[model samples]
Target chain A: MDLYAVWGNPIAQSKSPLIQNKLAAQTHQTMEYIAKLGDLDAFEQQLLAFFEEGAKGCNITSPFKERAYQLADEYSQRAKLAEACNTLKKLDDGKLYADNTDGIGLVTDLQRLNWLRPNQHVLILGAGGATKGVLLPLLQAQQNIVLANRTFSKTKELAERFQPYGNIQAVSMDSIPLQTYDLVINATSAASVDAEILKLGSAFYDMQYAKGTDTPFIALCKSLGLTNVSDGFGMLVAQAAHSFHLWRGVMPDFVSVYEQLKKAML
Target chain B: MDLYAVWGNPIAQSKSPLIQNKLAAQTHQTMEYIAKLGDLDAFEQQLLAFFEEGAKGCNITSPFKERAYQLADEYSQRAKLAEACNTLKKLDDGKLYADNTDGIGLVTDLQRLNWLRPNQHVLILGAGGATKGVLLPLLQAQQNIVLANRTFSKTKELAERFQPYGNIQAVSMDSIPLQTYDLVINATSAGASVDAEILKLGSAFYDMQYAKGTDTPFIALCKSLGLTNVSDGFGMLVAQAAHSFHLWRGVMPDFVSVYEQLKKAML
Candidate 1:
């Protein structure tokens, strides 16, 4: 049996182990998924010790993802472009390779719903780590991107980094882009904190998810007459499945875990 | 007298008030400096409230610098490149203007000691708000900068942002560059935390200050590396106060008096 885990400061709230275990069971892979509480100061230490203890691979979240990017010996092109990683796997050479599946995960879910199409204008909120990890894949989907953030400099920095990859622009939250978007993605943690949502488009996707009801961003979008909305539950499962595929070389059934989690949330 | 304050979450520990008050007294300007504890979720609210109450300007610290950057109406080129703002001044136009004095302060201190010269190789640790605020000025000094951080990507992002301005590269801490640096600036909070020291050859340093001790981790690393010319942020604090003074009043005070006054812990 292979040992797999998710490392985060507040690991208790993570559903990654449960999702990964289900994926493993369905794929007939003998792997165990566990949650490891990471210490704020000793993140690198804890991660190295986990690998030393023979962990096959692991997932990282919040505060530590950038540190994980620093620790990895090699990075996938997506992770390199995003400058962040959410997934890691140990190679046969005993070296750790990092990849950010967040963007791919969201793209996979969007494709599954027939929502992503070429040349669609997409607006993403926030320039935090979450947005950094997903910018590349979204741009690669042949979508035009407008990055909005509370601090224009941050969004501008991110836009500059990805400008070479595709058509992207950065704007302040107060100044709405001159052109309208077909889709809006809330990549910020503002949903957790109290924030004002703008009427950007009809289709809305929040990177955050609520257990059963519409996430705060989704609720805000719906309240503003946008009916096509999502709470990132699908993206969460799809990302976890992507991580599982990276570790096990088997693509687990994505819809079943998502549906089961959807029902459980209710 | 116009009112000013330092805004931060843990406002109790800030020395900006003491430093600013001293500078005001020396410059003979009518101003008051105080410390305001910031609300975690309501930083912008608190800032606007202060400004509405006729506050002239304010200094910002940890956890709120980025938020301050977001709140400002305009930013100085230094602040624009750093993506952080440490000082704010209300212009006659009734708009808040932001500038990061952290880099200028450190640079001024380096100039005072003749520590910084043109065309020196420098390595900076950490890629947080602290590093962001100082990168622009350091690059302008004509120094080659190699940014090393716990996260290589953060350094890479910073390097990319400032690339058009100067010569800078990002490298992981595990891999020390083949070339040696003339100076290494510790911009990380690891000095406050338990972190290992790298055996890079350079004079030891830090961007943080101590209460009553001089042996900060960076200084300790310098001693371990067998080097002298070590110092803390005492001079930086005084220099930044001068910058705030220049922004607020018609004159600037000499640093020696404030440095001595601050060292004696008498404002």
Candidate 2:
């Protein structure tokens, strides 16, 4: 069986093994998918050892994401600037090729929800990788963005960097002017915000999903009695599908899998 | 003072903050350089928060190098192909820029020792990033190379990909033909098989990984095998940082002069 694993420091928390195993099963591919808890100290060594041991591919997350990028023999310019990769595949050259599927995972789900539009007027919270990863895709989708964080101290400067790319305005929650927004993303562990600022965004998404039912960000939005809301579990499955495609050459029905997973979660 | 740091999971082990601080002092540039231990769980957050907090620049090592690359807004062909960056600078456009200084670091040190010659034949061990980074520079320096790794699976393939760039042969340690080699540079952290018979093959030896003193692991191996011509990668560590300083400040410091001074301290 071909070896595939999802590696992280707290690997037990991952649902990747389950999702990948199902994807392989549905697609009639024979592969053993497992979770490997990466050692924080020797994360690079363990990753090298895993690929050198002849594993076909692996998914990396969080702390190990940047290190995995370092180990790659080659990557696209997109992967380079993203500076993080969640998926790595050992190509025919025996060189590891890295790709960042995290943002695409989040973008694909938003598009599926019909929350993406030419004039989205998107409001993204937190100036972190979760927001950084999705910026290019969100901008390319032709959304007008007003990114809010507590303070840059770029939460404003970083937004100015991307100004060449799109209409993304970086704002501090404490200093944010009165605004109207369509979709507000909560990418933080959770953010403290004024109800008036929270009053915007007809639709809301918390990038923090597997922490489940409703994340702190989602709960805060719900307290505002917001109409449209969802968690990132679908985005999680969506990203796994993207990784599965890179390795297995097939996109196994993730929508059904996402439905099945959520239905069974109760 | 501009804020700078070298970030890694176990950052206490890094000499980057110290090296950059000294380099800054030597150049009359004032900056506060510190060691920031990255949180494995929240590394991405910390990086954003750092740039968010307005640090001028930082060096990323080991586990975080690749991630820092992801957070960057731009990088050149070198960083993308090497697939790693040891340095990142936030440019005038207010975007993160990543660059890999590892290969240039090794090649410059090799040149300093006269170990690199036109058409020099070299043997590089390991097929990972360390080997990959130094390949372009070594090849461009007009050297012929034989990359020997324990596994034929990777080394052979890696050499083929870089074949068009220059003369490079990838050989499996198990299947390598017994032949004389001018130089053998060890890039691996593992034991490589060498002997009196294999010893005679290499004229000079360089270890890309170094120790504080002269005897690095590979340097010791060469001595045991009676290979008298040997050097360690301490010069490379300093050289790499010099260029990182090169990009951030537009002035590459004297790596050799700096290296010699640092060596005196270790003594």
Candidate 3:
């Protein structure tokens, strides 16, 4: 069987195997995906060892995403813009090519849910690495984007980095307007634990997903009567499908994978 | 390794392995705790097969809890009252002894948080199996309880069943008092998915624990009400695992460490 895996410090809970294995089964590909715990200090060592063993490609999450970017011999434009890489593959020339599919994944999911539109105003929460990766594609959608975070400078720096792409600005969490937006995306990790902070317009999307049916952000949204809400589950499935496409040149059905996993979670 | 496991249908998310493994290590016990997915229709077969292979004891979760109750050759009084069994141990006589630690786990967790009090007014949401398991203990605490549910019959039945233990009454969700309560607990599965209802006067709320790390609906309700004392089931989960450890071994690991470990995974 073709060997592939996801590398993370805490890998047991990673849904990569479930997602990728579903893709493999649907596409009728002879492949196996596993979750491998990488030592925090020895990520490079472990990654190199896997590649040396003739592993085809792998997904990197959390602390290793930036490390994967640093290790790649070649980077896709998306990865270059994001300054992070999650999908990594060995090229024909034996060089490691890195790409960030997170943004496209989010865009695809929004489109699938009929939540995306050009010229729509979008508010993105947080300015961390996750925000960095998704900015390019979201900006490409020709939407007005406001990047908000607890620290103003972080989002300001990000706004400056992506200013050329579209209409994007940085705002502090306190300064965000209470007015509704076409779409609001949560890129912050703290949204999972912190109490509700802001009210948004039409729809709210959390980049963080719940192991159960609803994330705290979603629950908070429900409490506020914002029924048009979604989570990162779709993004996760879409991103994994994109990665599988990168490795195998076949786009698997993502919604089916999403439905199955959602059922399994409940 | 001494084989210990948790059996459930959707077993992927169970934290029992993480909790039990930590307990085993902290208490210097040599055992392996694993998450075993039981066949939806073949729980008994799978369970028997596990025991047949020399497994020591196991914990049960979700849809299997009540089925486990039925499968046990003998039951603790708590298990009989709850009509659910979560902790099961193999007897030397080849009979499986079952116990329900869920109530005690909740009580221990609430007491540890200093949230429980005797003779307080408590309101419980939902009349499902989850509500069934915790009512006896809450009543045992000498608290007055109001059991509310969408269907008046469910709560009324539960109230009738537990009235001998203490002061209890059943009410429909729409008719629940707008007045305050000393403690409000959510035992309903739908509480997570449904829209908010009923104005409750309470500073404390606990949503039965979920595999997900975020606060449950009741906890969120507590937040909206500006109630500071509210928690989810992670503590209950850790405490329940500790009780299971105590059942098989003679030691209980300090629960604080396990709670922190599980909390980190949520973030």
Candidate 4:
């Protein structure tokens, strides 16, 4: 049986094991997928050890994705552009190759909802690794992206850093100064506590989807006169599906898991 | 009067602050040296916050050496060879320059004891960052070195990687065919905790000491093997501090006062 795990700091809250275990069971693959709580000191050591111990593949989240990106022997074109990888597959020769499925996962879900198109101005709010991982993939899907963050230079730097991969414009939240956006992505955790619409775009796509309702960013978008809003439930399920496909050669049916998770949350 | 520190993980009981403060007091340099626990997740942000808030250059240790190396704009040849740095100096232009002083410190201490010369053969126990920092300076002193490590590949890789800068051979501890040497340096932390074999080819030896009075791994090896005329790494520490001081200020201070101050701490 191939060994696989999803690593995070507080990993019990992670839905990855649930999603991956289901995929493995359905495919009759004799692989074990579970959650791994990595230590802060030996996080990198744990990752290197996993590969050394002949693990088939693994998923990384939060603080470790960029570190995982650095550890990869090779990156897919998209992964290289993102400069972050959430998925790693160990090749036959004991080499680990990385790919970030976050962008494609978000993009695929958007396409499934008939949301993405050839020319759409998407504003992703936040300049963290989450925003970095998704920028190129969104732009590759032919969306004009504008990024806004609290710190101006950081957002601007990431925009410039990924400019060769896609078209992106960066600005500070306050500097945005009354602009309309087709899709507004809340790629930040701080949005929940920060109680103002500093730069809420027209149509909200809050990356934080808790249960059945809209996220804090989506609520801000709606409060500030935006009509359509969507949560990240679909995106989460879609990303898990992409990771499952990378681990096992079979694509999973994400619809059932999506419905089950939404039901369980309710 | 400025505050400075060495931000590092696993810094529970380091003597860095003790050494730095002693130098400051002795040299009439007004500064507070402390050790701060570093956050592994946001090192860059933490470093920026420290620099932005009016802290001067800080020493980096362990896992952060590479991160600091990558962040520095300019470096000495030794820093480049090691691909790691132990010291960061803030220039007048607000730029950070990296310098690897561990090797220089080892060499300086060895010279103080008259144990090292340009023609001696040197063998370092481990090819880790600590060893990497010291290898170049030892080579610059014109000593042929044999680097031995548990994972033979690490030693081999370091030797190959650093071959451009110096003459060195990488070999596994078991694979080292020679049984006699002029100097044997224990750079690995494992020597302090494990029953490591004393494989020295030399008459005089030096160790990077951690705790005084207690027999360190190198001292234990020397004691058990009936090798006299061996000492701990206290001199190396003082030498390294002087080198850092020289790099920051134009003048090198007498290390004697610093050593005396350090002795008071242990007493």
Quote the lDDT for A256 in model 1.
91
Place model 3 in a CAPRI quality band.
incorrect
User: lDDT: which candidate is best?
Assistant: 3
lDDT of 2 by residue, A112-227 (tens): 99988665567787886587767777777778787778766447766765667666776676765443466888888738677777785678988887543677777777888885
* DockQ for each model: 0.01, 0.01, 0.01, 0.00
For every model in order, the TM-score on chain A comes to 0.95, 0.94, 0.94, 0.90
Q: What interface Cα RMSD is found for model 1?
A: 18.0
Q: Tell me how much of the true interface, by contacts, candidate 4 captures.
A: 0.00
**Candidate 1, B1-267: lDDT as tens digits:** 799999998889887888888888887888999999999998899899899989999999988988898889988998788777888999888899999888888888888777798988777877555667777888889987877777777677887788898877776765434334577777776434323444345654554554355577667766666667677777887897788778877587878678876677642
For model 2, name the residue pairs that clash.
A66-B66, A66-B67, A82-B70, A83-B69, A83-B70, A84-B70, A152-A155, A154-A157
Find the 10 residues in a row with the least total lDDT in model 3 chain B: B191-200
Better model by TM-score: candidate 1 vs candidate 4: 1
Q: What is the TM-score of chain B alone in each candidate?
A: 0.90, 0.93, 0.90, 0.90
Per-residue lDDT of model 4, residues A1-266, tens digit only: 88899987979899888877877777787988888888877888988887788789998897788788888897887678777789999999878889999988899888877779765667677877478778878888878777778888889888887777555778787655233356778888845323233343446787788755667777776677665778888898898889889878888787777777778888
Stretches of candidate 2 off by over 4 Å are A210-212, B1-267
Return the TM-score for each candidate structure: 0.49, 0.49, 0.49, 0.47
Which pairs clash inside model 1?
Answer: none
Docking class for model 1 is incorrect
Chain B of candidate 4 vs. true chain B, TM: 0.90
lDDT of 2: 0.80
lDDT per residue (tens digit) for residues B30-92 in model 3: 899999999899888999999999998999988899898898998897888888889999888
